[PDB]
């Protein structure tokens, strides 16, 4: 399970024998990424499994209902960067027995949510990264104003505390990284390297490597 | 994921996989290790099919010759939301193991959310879908992509094929698993979004089909 990190004949970063010429260094290997996400899953389960919110399964019941398959935790995943993080995370949530459903928002909102009944529900946002915090600050503001959830929290895979310049603080953080551009496991440069299993610091000379439009 | 899973039954007669009870399941179509074995082999099948192909160079618009599939001009993967995102997340990582450079864009059809990629003409495009049942949705999807963009090639990779349910004539080029003509749940498949995050694919109990009628 542990991934071997080294260097090849050239100066290139290697992980399990495969060379990553775009990488300056490794932020976290896949085994490290999944271990923290498994622990975050237990953290999320402990924080939500006993909570109660509005019963929309049985609308004739005025009492708050526990988090079950009938009234699951609402997870909002931020495309495109969070879909791999989200796919792994909700599987670990199932391992911890926390019922949840996922809808996607794409961000300026490009693709709106299709879920409509978030009022008085516990809602969790799954985002790939929090750097300056501007994106998630406005997203949290918009969801609070338009949907009025019972609670609204944010779970990020990577937090860059050194970059925060607005009043935003994610409740749940898997990994903490420096203020460098990272790629891999959802992170990309013009959509490249998104499917890599590890998170790397990108070489600065690769930052403008693909200027052409997709 | 590739660890052997034990299928059993608890004292209540409910399906269990690795000791975990699944009251909504009538039977098991494929456990997680079966799922991931077929995906890894399918990724090698995908890599062998696309590795040596060439398509139009959009990285360098000054170039006139066709270009190989590289980071500069990767394979274009269109993932169909919502059912395909878990399948897609695992698949593109297996494709990286095989060294097939690819980029993913999402489309949501009933079209509710359109592609943001705009340079698909003369490109090799692979649609990644959860399941092909009656085939009407994929048939209309393939025809829409062909007419609007005219890619160099357009093929469909589905996690599950239900060939016994065909209404129209549609054959996905790549099929990881086949299922009986039943309603399936788990690993992307759901009833009103429930059970999507399960690691195995089960046949749903008919009594669970209408279990969650309320709008999310
Ligand atoms: O590949 C990447 N490596 C990074 O280090 C990084 N930091 C920020 N982002 C992207 O910028 C968007 C805005 O994030 P903030 O509003 O929190 O600053 C984020 O939503 C991200 O999409 C990154 N993408
Ligand atoms: O949970 C599910 N279990 C199933 O057996 C099933 N069969 C079809 N579908 C869904 O129907 C949509 C259209 O597929 P077809 O046009 O091929 O029938 C597909 O895209 C699927 O979303 C299923 N969903
Ligand atoms: Mg249930
Ligand atoms: Mg579908």
Q: Contact, B112 vs A110, CB < 8 A?
A: no
The residues near B67 (Cβ < 8 Å, ≥ 6 apart) are B54, B55, B56, B57, B59, B60, B73
Q: Which helix (H) or strand (E) holds A128?
A: strand A122-130
Distance from CA of B62 to the nearest CA of A (A): 12
DSSP letter (8 states) at residue B26: E
Which of B24, B110, B133 to mutate to test ligand 2, by most ligand atoms within 8 A of the CB atom? B133
Across the A:B interface, residue pairs with CB atoms under 8 Å apart total: 111
In chain B, where the domains are located: 1-216
The residue whose two tokens read 């991934």 is A3
Q: Which two tokens stand for residue B98?
A: 């095989």
* CATH 3.40.50.10470 for domain B1-216: no
A214/B117 CB distance under 8 A: yes
- Write phi, then psi, for B198 (nearest 5 degrees): -75, 150
* A132 CB within 6 A, ligand 1: yes
Residues B80 and B127 sit within 8 Å (Cβ to Cβ):
yes
Distance between CA atoms of A198 and A180, rounded to whole angstroms? 15
How far apart, in whole angstroms, are the C-alpha atoms of residue B183 and residue A108? 38
CATH 3.40.50.2020 applies to domain A1-214: yes
The 8 Å CB, 24+ separation contacts for A205-210 are A206/A22, A207/A181, A209/A22, A209/B71, A210/B59, A210/B71, A210/B72
Ligand 1 centroid–CA A135 distance in Å is 9
**Residue A214 · residue B119 · CB < 8 Å:** yes
Least distant ligand from the CA of A188: 1
Please, are residues A214 and A190 in contact by the beta-carbon 8 Å criterion? yes
Assign B128 to helix, strand or coil: strand
Spell out the SS3 assignment of B45-78: HHHHHHCCCEECCCCCCCCCCCEECCCCCCEEEE
Residue B186: name the closest of B208, B207, B201, B164 by CA. Answer: B201
Q: What is the DSSP pairing of strand A18-20 with strand A13-15? A: antiparallel
Q: Mapping DSSP to helix (H, G, I), strand (E, B) and coil, where does residue B180 land?
A: coil
Residue A103 is labelled as binding a ligand: no
Please tell me the distance from the alpha carbon of residue A132 to that of residue A80, in angstroms, as a whole number: 18
Determine the angle formed by the axes of helices A83-95 and A30-48, rounding to 10 degrees: 60
By the 8 A CB rule, do A145 and A137 touch? no
Helices (H) and strands (E) in chain B, counts: 3, 13
Torsion A59-A65-A68-A74 (CA) sign = positive
CA dihedral over B36, B38, B44, B49, signed as positive or negative: negative
Resolution of the experimental structure, in angstroms: 2.2
Rounded to whole angstroms, the Cα distance separating B156 from B170 reads 10
Would you say B156 and B129 are in contact if contact means Cβ atoms under 8 Å apart? yes
């Amino acid at each position: 399970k542990p991934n071997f990190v080294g260097r090849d004949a050239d100066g290139n970063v290697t992980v399990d024998g495969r060379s990553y010429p775009m990488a300056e260094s490794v932020v976290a290997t896949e085994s490290t990424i999944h271990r923290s996400m498994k622990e975050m899953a237990q953290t999320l389960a402990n924080a939500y499994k006993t909570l109660k919110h509005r019963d929309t399964h049985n609308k004739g019941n005025s009492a708050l209902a526990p988090i079950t398959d009938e009234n699951p935790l609402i997870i909002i995943s931020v495309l495109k960067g969070s879909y791999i993080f989200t796919a792994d995370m909700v599987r670990y949530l199932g391992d911890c027995g926390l019922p949840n459903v996922v809808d996607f928002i794409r961000i300026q909102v490009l693709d709106n949510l299709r879920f409509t009944e978030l009022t008085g529900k516990h809602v969790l946002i799954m985002e790939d990264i929090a750097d300056t915090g501007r994106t998630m600050k406005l997203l949290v503001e918009k969801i609070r104003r338009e949907y009025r959830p019972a609670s609204l929290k944010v779970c990020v895979l990577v937090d860059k505390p050194g970059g925060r310049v607005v009043d935003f603080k994610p409740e749940f953080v898997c990994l903490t990284a420096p203020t460098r551009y990272v790629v891999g496991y959802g992170f990309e440069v013009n959509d490249r390297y998104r499917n890599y299993r590890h998170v790397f610091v990108l070489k600065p000379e690769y930052a403008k490597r693909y200027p052409s439009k997709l």
